Design a protein around this ligand. Structure first.
Ligand code: ZN
Lengths: 148, 9
């Protein structure tokens, strides 16, 4: 079996959060079903009705040190925007990558990213980057290139 | 694996 986990976008801030549970559903004649979500590590008061098609998706993957090669210019990623009054995961696109040899601490690469919601730009390390799960494909391809 | 802890507002 392979586990499938989800993240949901909050209407409060436009950031994405891990989903702990789906509590209820509601339907409209106009379409676009909504689901009531309990967010991981937040509890009942933060519960939200979420557009299933638009704002629920398979969870983004925090990157392993070796997986920086699957983070490419042009990609949408889920990026940790760490400020002083808030620190939240936002969609961003990778503009450029500065790839450097790894050391004892792992990946030393740096990524220039542009957040989708405000067009602001930031240089971030791999530890702030979450991969969309389909990029597993890339890694799989790479894995097939190894020696038997 | 594990995400960083979000802090709202
Ligand atoms: Zn790297």
């Amino acid at each position: 079996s392979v586990s499938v986990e989800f993240e949901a976008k909050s209407a409060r801030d436009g950031a994405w959060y891990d989903v702990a549970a789906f509590l209820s559903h509601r339907l409209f004649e106009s379409g676009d079903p909504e689901v009531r979500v309990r967010f991981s590590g937040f509890g009942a008061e933060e519960d939200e009705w979420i557009n299933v098609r638009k704002c629920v998706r398979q969870r983004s993957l925090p990157c392993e040190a070796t997986e920086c090669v699957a983070v490419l210019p042009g990609d949408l990623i889920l990026c940790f925007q760490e400020g002083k009054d808030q620190a939240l995961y936002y969609d961003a696109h990778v503009l450029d990558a500065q790839r450097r040899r790894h050391d004892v601490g792992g990946c030393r690469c740096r990524f220039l990213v542009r957040y989708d919601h405000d067009s602001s730009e930031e240089i971030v390390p791999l530890r702030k980057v979450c991969r969309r799960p389909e990029t597993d494909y890339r890694l799989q391809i790479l894995h097939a290139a190894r020696a038997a | 694996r594990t995400k960083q802890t979000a802090r709202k507002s």
